[PDB]
Amino acid sequence: XXXXXXXXXXXXXXXXXXXXXXXXXXXXXXXXXXXXXXXXXXXXXXXXXXXXXXXXXXXXXXXXXXXXXXXXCQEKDVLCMFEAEMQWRRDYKVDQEIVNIIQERLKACQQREGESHRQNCAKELEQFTQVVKAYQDRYXXXXXXXXXXXXXXXXXXXXXXXXXXXXXX
Amino acid sequence: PPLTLEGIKDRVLYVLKLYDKIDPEKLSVNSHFMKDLGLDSLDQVEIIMAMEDEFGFEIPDIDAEKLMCPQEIVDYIADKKDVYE
Amino acid sequence: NINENNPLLINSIKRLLIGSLFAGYIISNNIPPTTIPQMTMPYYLKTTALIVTIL
Amino acid sequence: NMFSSLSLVTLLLLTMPIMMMSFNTYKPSNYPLYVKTAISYAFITSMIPTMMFIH
Amino acid sequence: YCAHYLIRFLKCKRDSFPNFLACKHERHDWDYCEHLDYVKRMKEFERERRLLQRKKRR
Amino acid sequence: XXXXXXXXXXXXXXXXXXXXXQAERLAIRSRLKREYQLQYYDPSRRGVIEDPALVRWTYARSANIYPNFRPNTKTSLLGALFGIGPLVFWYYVFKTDRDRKEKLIQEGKLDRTFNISY
Amino acid sequence: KYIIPTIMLMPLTWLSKNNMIWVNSTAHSLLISFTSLLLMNQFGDNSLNFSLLFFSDSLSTPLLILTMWLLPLMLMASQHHLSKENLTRKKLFITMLISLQLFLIMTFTAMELILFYILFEATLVPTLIIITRWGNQTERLNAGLYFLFYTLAGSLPLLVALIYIQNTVGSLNFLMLQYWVQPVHNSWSNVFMWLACMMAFMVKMPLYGLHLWLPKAHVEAPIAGSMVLAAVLLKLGGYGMLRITLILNPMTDFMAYPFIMLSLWGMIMTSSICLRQTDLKSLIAYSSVSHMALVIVAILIQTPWSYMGATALMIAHGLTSSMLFCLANSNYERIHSRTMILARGLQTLLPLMATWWLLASLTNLALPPTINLIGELFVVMSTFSWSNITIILMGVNMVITALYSLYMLIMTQRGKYTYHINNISPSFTRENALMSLHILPLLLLTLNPKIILGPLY
Amino acid sequence: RLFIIKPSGFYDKRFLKLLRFYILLTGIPVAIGITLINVXXXXXXXXXXXXXXXXXXXXXXXXXXXXXXXXX
Amino acid sequence: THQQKVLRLYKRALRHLESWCIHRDKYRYFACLLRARFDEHKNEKDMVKATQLLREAEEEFWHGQHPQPYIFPESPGGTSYERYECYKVPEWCLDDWHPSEKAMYPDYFAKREQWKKLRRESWEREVXXXXXXXXXXXXXXXXXXXXXXXXXXXXXXXXXXXXXXX
To answer: MF terms per GO, please (chain G)?
Structure first.
């Protein structure tokens, strides 16, 4: 819901014209199991939801925003660097599961189409290639173990390489 | 199927009677094949091979010399295969 | 040597016999295939599969 | 909707004797018969989603 | 190549559901498309063999 | 290890020296069995028997190390070349892979864009 | 919260009456082990400090829970042994376990390197008394002297190494303070500084070179078989390599290169010997070399993926090899020999213990995801990103990991034991209860391995 | 009829019964644990007004039993 | 012994013959051809010629030695059930059965208790009889049979008694 892209709408409609025989065995069993053990399961689920009555909403999600940039305060200080490194470690854990959503966007395309695979979609294929390539350069990958003090060096190495290429061209 | 003490003696006697080379009237069961019944040195091993094929196929080479009499051979085959309770 | 047919044996092999004969009718027709290979060579390719079993 | 529901049933039916393996309910001599009856209805519950797949 | 006749073959299985084994009219269309396509593929290889023999003479 | 013809019954003679040879082997075999026989057939025991053969068998591998290896000569030195030697062998295998990998990162990229893990 | 109730176990055994003792030591240890899974599990993005630096918080160490799990488990199998001797001898060697647990809690919790050092070597003293005494076979001294002159020979270079860091770069203390640590410039003077930090955790974490410390301690049994599990706790007790390599020398990996290869050959050759070996306790002693060598390889790569498997393997090995030693002990108190060939017979004589023999041997293999598959698989995946040639050697190791445990099975799954007449009672309640308390935690980690494998997971 | 093979059986089967007796003894709050999701509210996701960040439990999700453990 | 070596070779010859032939009538025919080969040299007794014949008997036999021979059903070595369906249980773990479970089937326990009392009492008498045998070393090849008939039990008591049954 909301975040997931998915397909617009599935068609799925049967005509059933060729061969009478016994109408349809797949449709007759589907209608039978809908009343046998599906409607009974729906009745028990509604009875438990109604029995709740009082429900607590609660805070759920915590805020925690900005708290100064890590690549501004330096020169080794315990009072300053500790909270700055906490922000970087929060974002790194968030970025891990951002990739997972984009990963599952490609999973949804493979399940729905199957036969088409690479001929259609294209948008989810392009979205995966753009984020992961940027993720490789900025967050870990070649920067070994997760550390915010070493993360500034990885950004500086990319900045020095880009400046060297721009000067030549 | 289980084997009986009277059944094992009857089964060994039936194979010994159809030997052709040995006389059915001369030897019954109690008589020894080594001295009393007409049997050669090579014939004694050949008679043991035919008896093993009919019953449970188990015959040691070292214990072949100890068994010569048909009464003793019937008892040795029943003891090794565990027969009659 | 005692050899006899048991009621457990009858209600097992007979149930396998239907599966070992009607497998070529149910499985092949139901599953949708892709690209048919049989077209060329009436004796060199098509008959060669059956002729090898005969020879 | 039932395709996803009935697919788990075939997996859950085979794990039910494992649930009864750890004592649960006593079954003398009928324990080999219980496995036979478990797979029998597991076959019927697997035949229905394949019929849906042909469609 | 077969797509014009291949659409009818999928229509038979979608309409029948039970008794899917009894389908011959749509099954013949899949046999008809493959018989013409393989013959055209054999004709292309035969034309290449005929052109190579003619070029060798000159 | 096996020869051209497998040994099972080949090359055996009766003679006189072989006749006394079997008498020697069966004498010790019966001597070591009778001491087992007196210890096996009694209800008052209850316990696992030791036997001097199996204790010395375990002692042959776990112990008797430093009393041995006093004439090293050359056979012991050849074992060290097969010992620490393979470590030197793999030392140039992985090093050539490092020179291949490190050069590709800086110039002419070989690592895929899909890669992100480790 | 953890220290003080653990110290109050010391007057418990001495004040209690002569008939009891063992009942009080086991019951009170189980309720304290419950509170470890109650309070320690709470953490944020970066794990926040506990209190003052007497004992601190856990960042990537749920290995404390394993020590709390073996806190009552070591007292169970030590019931059959020590029972013949005096009451004062019993009270001493129960309190030596409590003293071990006191120092072991202090090692994992306290986020330090200076005070951590005087707890790392401090665990060697109680084990020395336990190993040298109560030895069933001889050559106790050829394992007791070996226990110190291998560890202290490698760990005393930490005094010249750790103090050298704090005298130049601020102070070691919290490690959470340690952002002051600057990358090494790679000089010949800094070569032996790195080696001194490593060598302490190159002996307890067994390689192929200087590995002989381990099998000598296991073969010569301390008490029965449950004090052997304390030596397993010392393999995982050398977890400082997770802390030194990550913080003190992150740029240094050029000197790690030969030490990966030294541990890589401690996989093929350590598994080859463990095939023709006669002693049953030795077969677990050499299998413990290979499993801990996998951690050694993983740490020196320094990839974020390797630590996920390395930390998992510390918990995986600590509950599986200890399970295997309990099976060796269950035959040691019935047959009275460590010989594999002499003690042969399961199901025919040992009916229900044979299923425990299966589950313990199958965990050495790659079972459906318990912890051993999870722990090993990340290391194999990390080695391929390190160097592609590795799995050609690592795959051969996977063949002999079957031979590590199936050879243990085959030489026990035979209907013989003609020479043997003893071992009438297969398991006297607690004998199988030991085996269940080792496997059921691994079965609970199938559902939640997030609690086990957690260095920023 | 035969005397058959011999196993301890008595020591073996008693262990499984003694094990199950203590699993079922603490299997009662497991049965109550299912009804706690049924009777009491499970989870709700909503944007909170600026007043308090933590009350009893700081962050409660999925199960109500998470909040009960967060207090102690 | 020379006579035993011929008997062992002849026993192996017939049992290895069934691997080559399919039908029983051909097996009976080829057995008669083998008997004619042995009987020609059986009449003549020599210390040099017969020993050379036995050494040459291994030849030709070794040329057709491995066609995967029929190793019988319940037989030592070979293939197909050598120890399978014969695991059973030894008599050493019989007394291990605790009360409540031992109360079930009281006839099996009462008869075994009477047999165990007979074996324990005769163990002292058999120990003196075993050392009564003249050897003055330890033993020679096989165990000696008892001369006394009043006391019974010829040294070993649990040798023939207590065995595996399918």
So the answer is: NADH dehydrogenase (ubiquinone) activity; ubiquinone binding
